[PDB]
């Protein structure tokens, strides 16, 4: 069920305090141009203002649409520490202009990123060919299509980080590129309600 999907799951990768008052779940393709721009220009201030400060727990979930993006989503699993995993996805978004737009199977950009992060070639090769990880990514994607009605990206669910509450998923959904002021409005209002409730 959708309500069960909009909580931290045991295999989710987390960023920020697991017990933060607010929860943001994002689904996005790593090769999405507008997502890349959002991650370059808006997300860093969201992280500084709400994640680093313990106000909001962030959960990124992959939604790959192509070879590039699925292989990249797979390679992200070579990065275990929460900051490393986030920094890998950030590097892929930041490097979007550097894919090969003619040979869509060319993964030279991922070779670059792996080298810069000192990931050994044996680990790289294992991660980029790991069928168990590929299957998890594509099943989590089909589950989001089925249960949450996702088509385009980025999509965001922003809600109180309370496992006991029932909320209709479309009421906490935000789609597409949003400027910083949009999210600060939404998150500040939710946080204020969260704190009152917690006291």
Burial class (CB in 10 A: 0-12, 13-18, 19+), 50: buried
For residue 13, give the 3-state DSSP assignment.
coil
Contact 28, 178 (CB under 8 A): no
Contact 116, 81 (CB under 8 A): no
Name the CA dihedral angle for 136, 137, 140, 144, rounded to a multiple of 10 degrees.
Answer: -170
Distance, CA of 128 to CA of 76 (rounded, Å): 9
Beta bridge partners of 25: 59, 157
CATH superfamily of 1-66+131-199: Glutaredoxin (3.40.30.10)
User: Residue holding tokens 């590129």?
Assistant: 177
List the beta strands (DSSP E) in 85-199. Answer: 155-160, 173-175
Contact 138, 63 (CB under 8 A): no
Domain boundaries, the chain: 1-66+131-199, 67-130
Q: What is the CATH number that goes with domain 67-130? A: 1.10.40.80
Q: What are 195's two structure tokens?
A: 């704190």
Resolution of the structure in the document, Å = 1.6
For residue 137, give the 3-state DSSP assignment.
helix
Q: Is 25 left (phi over 0), alpha (psi -120 to 50) or beta?
A: beta
């Amino acid at each position: 069920t959708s309500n069960e999907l909009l909580l931290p799951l045991p295999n989710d990768k987390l960023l920020g305090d697991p017990k933060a008052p607010i929860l943001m779940i994002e689904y996005a393709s790593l090769t999405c141009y507008h997502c890349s721009l959002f991650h370059r220009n808006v997300f860093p201030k969201i992280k500084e203002k709400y994640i680093d400060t313990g106000k909001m727990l962030y959960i990124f979930r992959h939604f790959p649409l192509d070879y590039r993006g699925l292989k990249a989503a797979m390679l992200s699993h070579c990065y275990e520490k929460q900051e490393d995993y986030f920094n890998f996805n950030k590097a892929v978004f930041n490097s979007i202009d550097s894919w090969n737009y003619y040979n869509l199977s060319d993964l030279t950009l991922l070779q670059r990123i792996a080298a810069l992060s000192n990931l050994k070639q044996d680990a790289f090769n294992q991660c980029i060919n790991d069928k168990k990880i590929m299957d998890k990514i594509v099943n989590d994607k089909s589950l989001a299509i089925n249960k949450l009605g996702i088509t385009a990206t980025p999509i965001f669910f922003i809600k109180l980080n309370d496992d006991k509450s029932y909320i209709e998923h479309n009421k906490v959904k935000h789609g597409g590129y949003k400027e910083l002021k949009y999210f600060t409005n939404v998150i500040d209002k939710l946080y204020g309600k969260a704190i009152v409730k917690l006291e």
